[PDB]
Each structure stands twice: as C-alpha cells, then as structure tokens.
Curated annotation (Swiss-Prot), chain A:
One of the primary rRNA binding proteins. Located near the base of the L1 stalk, it is probably also mobile. Required for association of the 30S and 50S subunits to form the 70S ribosome, for tRNA binding and peptide bond formation. It has been suggested to have peptidyltransferase activity; this is highly controversial. In the E.coli 70S ribosome in the initiation state it has been modeled to make several contacts with the 16S rRNA (forming bridge B7b, PubMed:12809609); these contacts are broken in the model with bound EF-G. Residues 36-45 have a biased composition (Low complexity). SMART domains: Ribosomal_L2, Ribosomal_L2_C. PROSITE patterns: RIBOSOMAL_L2 (PS00467). It comes from the Bacteria. GO terms for cellular component: cytoplasm; cytosol; cytosolic large ribosomal subunit; DnaA-L2 complex. The keyword rRNA-binding applies. This is Large ribosomal subunit protein uL2. The modification N6-acetyllysine is found at K239. It comes from Escherichia coli (strain K12). Residues 25-50, 218-267 are annotated as: Disordered.
UniProtKB/Swiss-Prot annotation, chain B:
PROSITE patterns: RIBOSOMAL_L34. Keywords: Ribonucleoprotein, Ribosomal protein. GO terms for cellular component: cytoplasm; cytosolic large ribosomal subunit. Belongs to the bacterial ribosomal protein bL34 family. The keyword Protein biosynthesis does not apply. PANTHER family: LARGE RIBOSOMAL SUBUNIT PROTEIN BL34M, MITOCHONDRIAL RIBOSOMAL PROTEIN 34 FAMILY MEMBER. One of its GO terms (molecular function) is structural constituent of ribosome. This is Large ribosomal subunit protein bL34. GO terms for biological process: cytoplasmic translation. InterPro entries: Ribosomal_bL34 (IPR000271), Ribosomal_bL34_CS (IPR020939). Disulfide bonds: none annotated. Signal peptide: none annotated. The lineage of its organism: Bacteria, Pseudomonadati, Pseudomonadota, Gammaproteobacteria, Enterobacterales. Part of the 50S ribosomal subunit.
Length: 267, 46
RNA sequence: GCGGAUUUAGCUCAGUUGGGAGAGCGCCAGACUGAAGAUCUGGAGGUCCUGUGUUCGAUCCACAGAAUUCGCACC
RNA sequence: GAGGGCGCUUACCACUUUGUGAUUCAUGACUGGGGUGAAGUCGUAACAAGGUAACCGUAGGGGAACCUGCGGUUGGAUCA
RNA sequence: AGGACCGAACCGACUAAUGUUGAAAAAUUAGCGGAUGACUUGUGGCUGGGGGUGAAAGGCCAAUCAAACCGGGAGAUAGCU
RNA sequence: GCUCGCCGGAAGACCAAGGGUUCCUGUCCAACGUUAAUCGGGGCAGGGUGAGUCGACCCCUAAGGCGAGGCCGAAAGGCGUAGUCGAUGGGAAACAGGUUAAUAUUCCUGUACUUGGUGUUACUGCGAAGGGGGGACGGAGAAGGCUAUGUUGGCCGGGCGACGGUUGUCCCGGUUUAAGCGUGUAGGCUGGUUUUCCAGGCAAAUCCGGAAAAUCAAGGCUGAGGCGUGAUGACGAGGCACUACGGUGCUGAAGCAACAAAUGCCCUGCUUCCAGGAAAAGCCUCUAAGCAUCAGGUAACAUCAAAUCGUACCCCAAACCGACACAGGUGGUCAGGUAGAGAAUACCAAGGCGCUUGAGAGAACUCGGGUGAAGGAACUAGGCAAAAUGGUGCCGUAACUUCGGGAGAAGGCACGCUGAUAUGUAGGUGAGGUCCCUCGCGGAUGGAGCUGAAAUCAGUCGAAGAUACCAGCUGGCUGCAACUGUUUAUUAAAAACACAGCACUGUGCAAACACGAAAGUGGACGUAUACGGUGUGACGCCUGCCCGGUGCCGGAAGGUUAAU
RNA sequence: AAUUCCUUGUCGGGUAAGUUCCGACCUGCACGAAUGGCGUAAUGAUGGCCAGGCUGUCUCCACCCGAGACUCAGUGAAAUUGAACUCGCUGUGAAGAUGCAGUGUACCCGCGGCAAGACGGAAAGACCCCGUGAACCUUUACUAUAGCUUGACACUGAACA
RNA sequence: CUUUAAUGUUUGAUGUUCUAACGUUGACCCGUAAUCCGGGUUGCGGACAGUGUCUGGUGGGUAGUUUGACUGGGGCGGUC
C-alpha cells in the first residue's frame, strides 16, 4: 500500500483510523441485474459450520462465465464487492448489452475492451492463452476448461504463464506449480485491482464482519463439552489435538478425479 | 417467563389439531377412547 | 521406627566372582624449558567404618554396633 | 451658598493559595561507568608474517582479546 | 465523522434499602446508563430425547432439568429400619 | 350544590390476540363484592353492533409447505422440477352534514367510481404464454412553503360587570367553508422533432440498447397548497312555546384578517454514507400466431351484478395472563397545554370517575432524620446513611504528547425587581401607498401590523435572589483488558476476555467439513492474499536462544517380522 | 508476584505512632519470549483507604407528623403436630433435670414485654460411610465403538520392455 | 543330468501405458420460454473410484464401571 491512489488513514480525533478512506467507488441504486443469498446455514439439520450469526448475507453481482469475447465493449464506471474485496466494472458491449467485468487497478477511458481467437490481445472479456503472449498477469483462468473462472477477484493472485510447457500444459502459482491445466483455458488480465482493500486491516471490528455474520473467535477455549480439553482451574497445559482429523502438518488427499499435483515441494 | 395458559387458533397445527389427531395414529386411539368408545363429546371445534 | 545409600588415593567417585586394589586429575622424577605448566613416559598416592561369622581367600556378603544421609511413618 | 470632616460607591493593593513546577542541600535502602595497575588470578590478539596478521564506519557471535567477510588509499617481507 | 462524551419508555441485571411468615422461583422508591446500533423488539411455520443454537453455558431449556411435565418396560433391584 | 382529587406516555380513540355478545337501561342479591352494598363485565328482562368501498379471496411470493415422472426404498419414510398453496409484500378503493340507548367509512343525504356483463350513438387495425422501461425499498437528513392549532383584536351576541373598583378603551362568546373540479406554483427530471440503420433483446418487434443523418433551440410528464368554484348549502348569539324533562316543536345572530411552531402534508423530490435495501403485478407499450367487408379497445352517457365474513363489549392492557379488582409483562393507533435542553419533574380540561377496611387512641417494639453546644470521621466488613457540589461566562488552571485528549480541569460569582439610552435599543418581519412588466400563482419601490436579544449608566432590598421541582468530589494512587461494553441471567459483576494482525497449516481443487438412509444445501455463484486451524492479546517493537528428553510429523539408506 | 524457603529482614528518614503517607546497600527455593514481554488512550455498569469538605459515625440520642402492632368494629385460612395441671444454676448419670427432691414456695388471666428455654422451624443435615452401588465432567493411567489413516485380497484386462 | 545359454513348448509378475469399463458435480447439442431431470456428440481424467474386514496406534470427540477388607474414620506403612 506504498501505491497510488492510496487513501492513507486519519489523524487520531476519533476511535477509528481505519476503515478504508476510498472516496469515488460506492454507488446507488442496485441496478436492474442483481441477486441475493438466503436463510442461515440450514444444511438439513445439525450444521457443522460453527458460530453462524446469519442475518444480512445479502446481495451479489450476477455475471459469471462472461464468455462474450469477440464483440467489442467500453467502461461505464467501477464499483466494489463486500463478498470478495473485488474491483468490478460496468461494461457496455457496443452490440446493445450491459454486463459486469472483473478489473485491474484503474482500467478506464472507456478504453478498447475486446477479445477473439488470435484476432485480439488487449485486457479482454475472457481470452484463450494459446493465442496470446507470456507474462505474470492472466487473471480469469477457467478452473478447468469450460467450468468457469478461478479468480473472481483482482486481490493480487498472479498465476504466471510458462511458454511451451510439456506441450501447452502451463502456469506457475503459489501452492502447486504442476497444475498442468492446458492453455486452452481462458485468460482476461490482470491481478491487481484494489490490493488496498485486503493488504491492510479495515477494522477491529468493522461492517465487513458483524452486521450479518459472526467469524469464529473460539474452539479449544471454554466449556469442555465440544473439544478434547479439559478438567477446569483455568489450567489447560496438556496435549490436546483437533481430533479425529488433525492440525499442524500431515496432508489429507490420496485419490481424486483429475488429481494434477505431481512433484509437491510444500515448504 | 411469560407464563402461560392462553387461547389462540393458529398454534394448533403442530400440537392441538383435530384432523392431525386423526392423521397421526398416535392421536387416533386417543380420539376413539375419548368419544366414539368413551361414551362422550368434545365439540370445541371453533 | 523400617528400608535404602555411604565411611575406596588432594579432587570426582569408578570397582567388587569373595585371591590383583583402580583411572579422568594433582604431586614426584625423567627431560624439552634458566624455570614451571601444557604435552610427554616412568613412578607413586589407601583408616577400602569397626567388630563377628560364612569362606580356600571378606574391600565387598550375612549378622551386631557406631556414624553421616534420604524417602515414607506424625496431621 | 461650598467643602472638608464622613459615608456611601469601588479599585491600585498587604495579608491569603487553586496550585504546583525552576533549582540548592544530605537521609543517597536492585547498582555499574572512565582508572591507579604492593606482588592479584582465568585468558593474551594486535605495535616484523607479535612466528595458518588484519587497522576503517561497523552490523554480529557472545570468556572478545570482537573474531571475520567485502572496498581501498601499501603507515604489513619478496622474484610469491 | 465515531460500537461520539452527556440524551426516553424498545436494555438488563452490582449492593442494598421496606425483597424471605412471598405482590414474589422473582420484582422493587425518591436513584441511574449502553444514546442508534458488538442494540432488543413482538403473529408463525425448520432444530421433537438422551437433545442442539454456541459471545461458548454446566446456567439454560416451565419456572427446582447432569434429562425433566411421559406413562406404556415394571406393583424394577431389593444386603432397606 | 360546595371546596378539592387519581390515571397526566389517561383505565381519551378503533379494533386485530377469540375469548366471544355479561356494554346503555328496565331492575337485583346468590351462584357473589374478606366493609356498607345503591355499585362490581357480577345478572338478570329487552334487544342488539346496519360495510359494493374497512380489511384477507383475487391476478400475486422471499422464506417455507407439498408435488407428476423419479434416485431410492426392510415395512416406515427422505429429498425435489413443472405446478400450486402463499402477506406480516403489493394494486384500485370515504368525506362534510345528520341519528338511533346503542353500534356507526355503513344508517341516511349527496358527491359522484371501481371491477365486470349489457345498450344507443361515435372513433380507431387488434393482439401473448415471449421483449423493454422500472414495478423497488434501507434511515440519518438538508432546504422551502402549507399552516394544524392557538392567541389577538377590526366585527358581531351580552352589558358595564354581587365585596373594593369599575358606564370608549373593558371582557367575555362563536371566529366554520366540506366535496372534485380546476392546473401547476415551491424544488425537481429532461434541450425539442423527424429520417436512415445494426456484430444486440428466448422466433419476432413502431418498444429497449447502440449508431448514423436531417430539421428545429423556448419543447415534455405534476406537485403541498395558496387561490377559487359550491353556497338564497347552512350552522348558529338569541326570540316564542310545548314536554314523555331525553328533548323537539316554531324561528334566528354574526360570519375579518394577522402572528408563530408540528408529532403531519410536499420530498419513490434532493443530498449524504455503505452492511450492499427480495419476486409475480397495476403504470407505460412492443410484437408471435391468428383474425383479417370479421373481430378487438376507448369514449359520451344509459344500467345491472356488486359472491358465505366480520363489525358487540376490551388494551403502551381485571372476563388474556398473572390465576387473592395482584409492586410479571407490554402494543401498531389522533398526539391535549404555556414558560422546559426533556416521554427530565410537584401543577392540568376531559374519559373512566376519587378506585366498598377506618374510627378513634398517641408507652418502649426503628420501613427514620435534623438542625445539634463540643470536636471532625477519634465509627467500623461498607464518609454506609443525610448530601453538597450540578449554568452560559469570567476577574483566568497542574503532572503528562498517543500534540485529539488529560480541559463544562480546578476556582467562587454578579444573578431578585425595574429607570434611562429605548412613549423600547439591535436583530427578525414586509402591509399598503407608489411605479414597471412578460400580461398573471410576475417583479421594483416601499415601513404598516407583530416581535424581541444583549449590555451600559444608575439604583437598593436580604438571614436569604441561577430565592422552586432537572442535573457532578480537583484529586493523586495500582496491575494498563488498550476499541463503548453487559458477555457466563444462579455466588463473582469482571480483577472474564470477543478483538485483530501471522509465520505455519487442510484444499491445485467434484475444494476442508456429511448433519439426512439418496442430497451437494454452508463455504458458492466461489481458489491455496477466497474459507477453516489451535490461539493471538491496543500500538509499536521484540521474540534473544539452547535439541537432552518428549512431541509434530516426514522418509527409506535398513533390521525387528504381517493380512499378502 | 499467590517464590517473599530463611523472621512482620532492611538504613532509618518523615510521622501525636510508619506490621507504611514509601523514603531504592536487597537475604532472589518452585522469574519470562505468544500460558510473552519494557510500557500506555481518553471512558469507570469503580476495586482499596487517604486529605479537606459538610457532619452527630464512636461514646451522648433524652423532643417530635408520624406507618402501625397489642386496642375498637367486617373477616381469620396453614409452612402440622409431645398428654401440661410444662420448677428459676439445681443434684444423679442407658455421661444434659420445665417430671430419679437437697432446698425457696411462683393465686386466676393479659399471648402485652416476649430476653436462654418444642434445640426449633424454610428441608431426605453440607461434613457422608456398611453402599455387590443413578451416572457425573477427564489424562503421554485403562480403553472402546463411531472414526483417522495408508499398504491388501476381494474386484476392473495384457500387450510390450 | 546340472551350475546355465540360444529357442521352442508350458506359464506367473512389475514396470510401460491405450482405453467401448467408469465418473461425468465439464462443455456443446438437446426434450424445454425448465433450478429437477431424459438422452447423444464431445471433452476429461482413468481400472483410479467403492467400501467388506484382517494388521497398525491415535485420542479422552458415546458409553461404561467405581471391584474387597483390616478403619482407637480414612490417603500412605502392615497383613487371608
């Protein structure tokens, strides 16, 4: 958060330094194309996801796939997403259609947003990687070939193309540089939108986490009726694991469909 | 705390309901032992 | 009280079939140093608790006593 | 009729304190800094290669006696 | 702007004071805040037994539940006067 | 009568928890009112609560019931598409007068309207199961007007008003203007009108999204209400009788403008901040088929249908509940009043109505306190109790930097009632009179009628004036949870600790978890910077160090010796 | 600090008196790196005595409007039970004299004082064991079922190297 | 007749892969103004999955029990 435009916190004349002082990206109304998520954990019956607090979920931005590549478009405005920290834009497709696309740091003018098979190369709707050049930035990447993108945010997550890797089977990311997903999956570009919303804490608490969920706060500590410890007296002080399932290192997988992970350096 | 006895209609559908006292077999023996064999009445149908 | 340990070389304690009394180390000489230590080869250093018994031979065990010492017995 | 004597009005203003701080004395109740080096002891890297150096800002192991690894300007022996 | 400092009935729960031989398994009088939300607030259908939601309590949960308001096992075991 | 009370966030209003018809009166005492007992919904004889518009069918649904065929299933039963239920989401949709004990959007009495058949004239190309406008929100607000309603007097009814005073400058009483039509104003939204074409919109498309020209700028959709229309429509001071003494019978004044604020109207205006305020519809139009000299719809006015209830007592709360008209709870609802920071408090007019145990007596029997000579906590587990101190402003105040804050620190103080500037200052207000203009809900000049600080010079009455109800110990110390706290209602009232960052950890992904027997519903409309482990202990530094044992697991050089 | 192993350790300054208003030579068992440590923001649902207030907090409350309760009228129910005409240290011990008599000799009644006097009441005493014993929570004892976990035969084939 | 080779003729296994199993919780096509859901071109990994017991500790995540007696009442120290 050395970056710009940064919005740095306040001089201490109120209890709050954070939250994020980003003028110029909330907006109203919730435009015509919108939806919501509903009830509480409600799994049928005795829910395993602890603490809940499930009021105000509430609404989400509706556009998944975004597979309209070839038809050119332009940038109307950009917003924010309280479900992902995501920098999303509202995009008018010159054919006659309005849509919501995931964006980098300030992509406006309203620029030249287009894709198409070898025909184009710009920051472009969704776009196949075996038809464009090699960099750090890629973004959308169908989590497998036609299913849907992997990353619904521009939170910072660089996936990194390799050129000709074992015949198109590419990328280089964080926890498994042997994804071997073929370059027949779709890009868009690129991974830093608002790092400012995530790289720094918004509050201790904040609206982000107490108006419609409760996070986690305990497991081990108090009332021995749930976890493997213990007697009383404030004491704790034993061996008490996360049983029957584990904690501090072991792994969990052995067999799956696709299963592509191979070498695994871990640590 | 807000103790206790009160009358109402809409709360009868999971507990106090005459068609459910025939729908459930658990109610159905009671219903006959209380009037059809039990020499009696209920009539409180309102 | 009972049951254990301990009284084996200046230091630290190893060791006992139950027949020899030990080395890490300190001294002594030997020479290398004017000297001394290191390091060095040689040599030495003993209340092996006392008493009685078993025994071929008791430092050792068994038994009686003495004494340091510890855990528990006490509330 | 007029003041000044008074008798009201009120202040400059002595006492007085809401306060708490300058700085000067001994009563200096866990100490550690810079040395003489009346025999100090453990150690001993540097003033020639102080007999398989390392000076300089110094960051670090932590008996430092600061080892030790760059960058020089030869106040460090040559035919390395 | 800020779960601001200091504000009403919509909040609970500090010691007392006339609460114990009850107005009462809980609430009180001159007093007193958290001041817009780590608020509580109400029609009803999803938590129906050894429970099931966790500001995480052995307190709850009919008011006294470490399994009770069930009566069908069962007029049980019975070292029991 | 006569003097005063309780509820004062009223037991004012209409009615929703269904308990149900036990209100008025005509008359009454067990089956009851821990007193009388006339009253208490007691309890008895009558009767009753008039709804096309109130709200719920409807067309309608977010959550959630059920559900074809089914994946399944011991017998049970589980989960679900199309459908179909479905409000506490939405849409059209009662007012001034009068009249019965009541009970009243009803009743009457007129105004005149909403859904759908029908008729006589008139106009016109219509349509859907599909398209698009939005149909739709959340509260703090900001800004202008309307004045609700009050006080005043011109003006009108009464008269000079029982003590002392009062006969034109007093002192009382009404102070109403209904409709729907008519038009448009306050802020606001939007430059007007045609023509030609697409990489678009479930097949289409006069409607929507994007494009490409033409011709013009003054164009379009209302809105509280002022204002007015109605209305020789009435209400009513009073006048004259009659009575079943309730009233109704006959008749009747007056009838203007100012001044100041809403709890409400405009404002799904317009602003400001983000947890991110839910769908079928009315509102407004596009076509598909198929009609197609046919049919449909919109309009003047003529009519009929207006689809079983409920409407009675009753509430910020005695026929609910508590169960003794119970010091539990606890409402959407008209907001009654002046000075008030206030739903902070002794005072109110009313509506029910003063609430069916009170006479005398005046030992000690602490449900208590006050002013004490002395002294000032010399008491003690509890300066406990009784407080007191509680404004703007100032004659001016200390440690401490997180330079906010520690600062209504602290200290003590003029305070009543009024001359004079000022037959009220200033400031707020804008009648008329006079002029202009675009023609009309228009502006310029101007000072009528209300109102009301804040001080300066001067007074002097105190034992007392913020003469009264609201409402505070400077401290200064110990251990810094560092965010207010209300979070373990049940010993503690926090001296509990819920923050929240992160190295590491479980998932390269049909992800971790499986609750339900078949779910893939949390997480997901989502990627290892998403969500979870175990925690973290403001902030900011700082985590030195040291691997014996013992964990955490990983592995294979290699033996203990297995289902294979 | 809940180590103060040793004892209320101190030097003694301040002080009607320092078992401390602290006013820096320690006597350190069983101190700390996330069960953490050098520290602190303004807030008190504020824990513990310490100034000056105001004083009746001691010892000293003897006066009071006064609730009422004994009194006078309506009404009078049980938290359930030892006959009473129940001697005020009494003595003697199935180790307790309102009843084994040495004494004093208390008229009948206020249920008005009602101060020790059903050891009493609110009730299977909490200290609690004979318990062939309700289950009631744990831990590098004991484990077990559900599970965690991989390798294994069942099952799903050999063509080549 | 073998320590052993080349081949025939009898035959087991592990690597090495392709792949009508299979799973489609991936698309396109498709019954269909369709969230369940029918079925194929295709795409994907792949004999993987699924669990039935056998071997293994791993934890106090159901349930269970309180296993003598000796008591100048208990815990230790002694005995039938």
């Amino acid at each position: 958060v050395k970056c710009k435009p940064t919005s740095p916190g306040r001089r201490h004349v109120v209890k709050v330094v954070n939250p994020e002082l980003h003028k110029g990206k909330p907006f109203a109304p919730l435009l015509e194309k919108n939806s919501k998520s509903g009830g509480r954990n409600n799994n049928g019956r005795i829910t395993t996801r602890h603490i809940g607090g499930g009021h105000k979920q509430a609404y989400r931005i509706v556009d998944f796939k975004r597979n309209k590549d070839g038809i050119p478009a332009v940038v109307e405005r950009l917003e924010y997403d309280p479900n992902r920290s995501a920098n999303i834009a509202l995009v008018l497709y010159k054919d006659g259609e309005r849509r919501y696309i995931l964006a980098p740091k300030g992509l406006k003018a309203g620029d030249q947003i287009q894709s198409g098979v070898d025909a184009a190369i710009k920051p472009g709707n969704t776009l196949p990687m075996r038809n464009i050049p090699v960099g750090s930035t890629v973004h959308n990447v169908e989590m497998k070939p036609g299913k849907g993108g992997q990353l619904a945010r521009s939170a910072g997550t660089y996936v990194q193309i390799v050129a000709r890797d074992g015949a198109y089977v590419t990328l280089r990311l964080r926890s498994g540089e042997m994804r071997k997903v073929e370059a027949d999956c779709r890009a868009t570009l690129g991974e830093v939108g608002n790092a400012e919303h995530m790289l720094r804490v918004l509050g201790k608490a904040g609206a982000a986490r107490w108006r419609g969920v409760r996070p986690t706060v305990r497991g081990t500590a108090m009332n021995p009726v749930d976890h493997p410890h213990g007697g009383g007296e404030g004491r704790n002080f034993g061996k008490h694991p996360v049983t029957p399932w584990g904690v501090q290192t072991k792994g969990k997988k052995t067999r799956s469909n696709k299963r592509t992970d191979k070498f695994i350096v871990r640590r | 705390m807000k103790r206790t006895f009160q009358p109402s209609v809409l709360k009868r559908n999971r507990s106090h309901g005459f068609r459910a006292r025939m729908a459930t077999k658990n109610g159905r023996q009671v219903l006959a032992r209380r009037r059809a064999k039990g020499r009696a009445r209920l009539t409180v149908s309102k």
